[PDB]
Amino acid sequence: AEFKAGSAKKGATLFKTRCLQCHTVEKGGPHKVGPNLHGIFGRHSGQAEGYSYTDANIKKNVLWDENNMSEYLTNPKKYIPGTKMAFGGLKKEKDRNDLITYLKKATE
Numbered sequence: 285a286e287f288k289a290g291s292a293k294k295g296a297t298l299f300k301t302r303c304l305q306c307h308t309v310e311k312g313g314p315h316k317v318g319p320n321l322h323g324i325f326g327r328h329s330g331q332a333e334g335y336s337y338t339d340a341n342i343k344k345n346v347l348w349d350e351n352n353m354s355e356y357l358t359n360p361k362k363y364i365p366g367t368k369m370a371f372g373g374l375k376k377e378k379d380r381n382d383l384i385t386y387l388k389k390a391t392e
């Protein structure tokens with residue numbers, strides 16, 4: 285919603301414990317159950333090469349930035365009804381800020 289840069293060190297810890305099970309961040313990194321996230325910021329949803337998305341994730345057609353990413357991560361199935369994942373969200377604004385601060389660098 286209203287992103288402010290936090291701590292990437294904490295964000296990296298949050299990524300490992302809440303995201304890495306399903307996602308990688310490096311260029312060329314493997315898809316897991318979820319897509320590799322390199323280049324995610326500034327790109328339209330559904331466009332990781334080699335990954336097959338749900339209709340819901342494609343049709344949202346959101347151009348990812350820090351703010352819509354923070355809303356999405358709060359509750360992905362609320363922001364994209366019908367998206368499929370065994371992930372329930374990062375409810376704390378401070379965690380999202382830290383995570384996104386790391387992710388912006390890690391996927392760059």
Ligand code: HEC
Nearest residue numbers: 302303306317318329330331337338341367368369370371
């Ligand atoms: C497994 C239980 C997952 C966890 C943990 C995380 N993600 Fe996820 N993610 C997962 C799937 C199966 C998908 C595609 C869903 C679909 O409907 O096709 C996603 C998608 C994303 C996206 C969108 C990618 C795009 O539009 O190209 C993003 C930005 C994303 N995931 C980020 C993300 C973060 C930051 C996580 C930890 C807080 C996280 N995911 C965990 C599966 C799973």
